[PDB]
Curated annotation (Swiss-Prot):
Keyword DNA-binding (UniProt): no
Record has Membrane as a keyword: yes
Keywords: Cell membrane, Disulfide bond, G-protein coupled receptor, Glycoprotein, Membrane, Receptor, Transducer, Transmembrane, Transmembrane helix
Compartment annotation: Cell membrane
Family: Belongs to the G-protein coupled receptor 1 family.
Misc note: Selective antagonists, such as montelukast (Singulair), zafirlukast (Accolate) and pranlukast (Onon), are used in the treatment of the asthma crisis.
Gene Ontology cellular component terms for the protein in this record: membrane; plasma membrane
Taxonomic lineage from the root: Eukaryota, Metazoa, Chordata, Craniata, Vertebrata
GO molecular function per UniProt: cysteinyl leukotriene receptor activity; G protein-coupled peptide receptor activity; leukotriene receptor activity
Residue numbers of the full-length protein present here: 14 to 299 of 337
Top-level taxon of origin: Eukaryota
Name the UniProt record assigns to this protein: Cysteinyl leukotriene receptor 1
Cytoplasmic side: 37-44, 115-128, 202-300
Disulfide cross-links: C83-C160
Main location: membrane
Length: 369
């Protein structure tokens, strides 16, 4: 037994931070470029996207300093201020990203679940105020990391990013860990679980209703081919009334009494009259009063669900489980080297995974933008 982790720590950190810095800087730099140079009006999603991009760039610009530290066999050479600023920067990026993803999911939920006054309840103006609130809250609550005591080794060398290794146990660090775990990870994660449950159930209801509208449109076209005659008519009439009751995907957000909805409902009314009269005359109505009405908002919601869920399971969750395990391990009487090694290797991996959160945000823009 010895400090066998020291070479592993410096090898894995140098590789992963170097990779996260390059992928993170170019990915979010590109996303920021594309969003800044926008001509069409900014969405609530775009407000959250710009803020995620900035929170990611703020942190990727500090990661090259972490790289220089581990390349130097754990010797800090930039002073106290830059050590406290590099530590603070990671926690600010991590908790800002958790809050922006939560706020984005919450907004998209109210948009999907409640399309009546959705465009007035979940506005770009509202997104801007929430983000400011998120920045102030995170910047203030994370400040103790800026006013922490400097770390020095046996040989009086300046250290940075040191974990409570062994017997460095404190009860109020454990109380701060729990408030942070609940407010900063468990409450945001529960809101996402609930919101995503509501979106998925809503998406099934709308997907099944659009299959019936696709089924009535299929029967109208099929019985038209059955003519080229009393049986085909009795079948098209029951379906044309059924299709009239259904709402098309194109006019899903608009009101039921809207003049856009009235036109589609009247189109089936003119077609029902032509059906009772009876083939090339009713084929004209289905190509002028109903062809236009018979969804992307559904694809952007699925894209968001997949990237954000992965970001929570892969990046945010292992760090928060490991921090709970680690802090309690310090309070335990017995500490063998075979357990202290596997604990320290996990700190290296779960922190690298937490820092890799900036790599998920360009993917959120491709799949949900
Ligand atoms: C980020 O808070 C920690 C981080 C660590 C930590 O990560 N330590 S580690 O060695 O690097 C590591 C890495 C990977 C796995 C395991 C470990 C131990 C340990 C304890 C803590 C808890 C903690 C100790 N004080 C003195 C604090 C002061 C203020 C805050 N406010 C905070 O959080 O507010 C955010 C949530 C709401 C908004 C922002 C927390 C703390
Ligand atoms: C939106 C703006 C709000 C941002 C204001 C900053 C937080 C202020 C007070 C909370 C102090 C609670 C910290 C004490 C923990 C108790 C355990
Ligand atoms: C909510 C998550 C529950 C938090 C997990 C409870 C921590 C208990 C633990 O893992 O540590 C026990 C150890 O014996 C004590 O030093
Ligand atoms: C070290 C960490 C402290 C630095 C403070 C960082 C806050 C500064 C800028 C964030 C705002 C950038 C986003 C602009 C978009 C405006 C918006 O939609 O809210
Ligand atoms: C940008 C990403 C990585 C750059 C890291 C710098 C490592 C080179 C050694 C420089 C030094 O320590 O003097
Ligand atoms: C700021 C108030 C917000 C309240 C939400 C936070 C929820 C925290 C609730 C329970 C966590 C239990 C805290 C007990 C401390 C255990 C650490 C110890 O002393 O060993
Ligand atoms: C609606 C989204 C669908 C995805 C499912 C998300 C829910 C997953 C939540 C928690 C998974 C927790 C698993 C943690 C295992 C590690 C525990 C351990 O062995 O110590
Ligand atoms: C699964 C986790 C939590 C279930 C939460 C129940 C609230 C869902 C409301 C149902 C709905 O209208 O879609
Ligand atoms: C929470 C449940 C998670 C996933 C449910 C997936 C079921 C897929 C059936 C889709 C059927 C359809 O699209 O018509
Ligand atoms: C990654 C999961 C997202 C897949 C669903 C969206 C596919 C369409 C697209 O945005 O390219
Ligand atoms: Na992020």
């Amino acid at each position: 037994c010895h400090d066998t982790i020291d070479d592993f720590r410096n090898q894995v950190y140098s590789t992963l931070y170097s990779m996260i810095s390059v992928v993170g800087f170019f990915g979010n730099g590109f996303v920021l470029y594309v969003l800044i140079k926008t001509y069409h009006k900014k969405s609530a999603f775009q407000v959250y996207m710009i803020n995620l991009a900035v929170a990611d760039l703020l942190c990727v610009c500090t990661l090259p300093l972490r790289v220089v530290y581990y390349v130097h066999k754990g010797i800090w050479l930039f002073g106290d201020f830059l050590c406290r600023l590099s530590t603070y920067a990671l926690y600010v990026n991590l908790y800002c990203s958790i809050f922006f993803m939560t706020a984005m999911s919450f907004f998209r939920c109210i948009a999907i679940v409640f399309p009546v006054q959705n465009i007035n309840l979940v506005t770009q103006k509202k997104a801007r105020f929430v983000c400011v609130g998120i920045w102030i809250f995170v910047i203030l609550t994370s400040s103790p990391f800026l006013m922490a005591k400097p770390q020095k080794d046996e040989k009086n060398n300046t250290k940075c990013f040191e974990p409570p290794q062994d017997n460095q146990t404190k009860n109020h660090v454990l109380v701060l860990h729990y408030v942070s775990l609940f407010v900063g990870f468990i409450i945001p994660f529960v809101i996402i679980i609930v919101c995503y449950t509501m979106i998925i159930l809503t998406l099934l209801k709308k997907s099944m209703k659009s299959a019936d509208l696709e089924d009535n449109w299929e029967t109208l076209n099929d019985n038209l081919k059955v003519i080229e005659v009393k049986d085909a008519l009795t079948k098209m009439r029951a379906a044309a009334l059924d299709a009239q009751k259904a709402t098309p995907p194109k006019l899903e957000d608009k009101s039921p009494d809207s003049p856009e909805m009235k036109d589609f409902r009247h189109g089936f009314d003119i077609l029902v009259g032509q059906i009772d009269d009876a083939a090339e005359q009713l084929k004209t109505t289905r190509n002028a009063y109903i062809q236009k009405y018979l969804l992307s908002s559904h694809k952007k919601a699925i894209g968001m669900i997949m990237v954000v869920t992965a970001a929570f399971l892969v990046s945010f969750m292992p760090y928060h489980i490991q921090r709970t395990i680690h802090l309690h391990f310090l309070h335990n009487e017995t500490k063998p080297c075979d357990s202290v090694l596997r604990m320290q290797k996990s700190v290296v991996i779960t922190l690298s995974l937490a820092a890799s959160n900036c790599c998920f945000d360009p993917l959120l823009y491709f799949f949900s933008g």
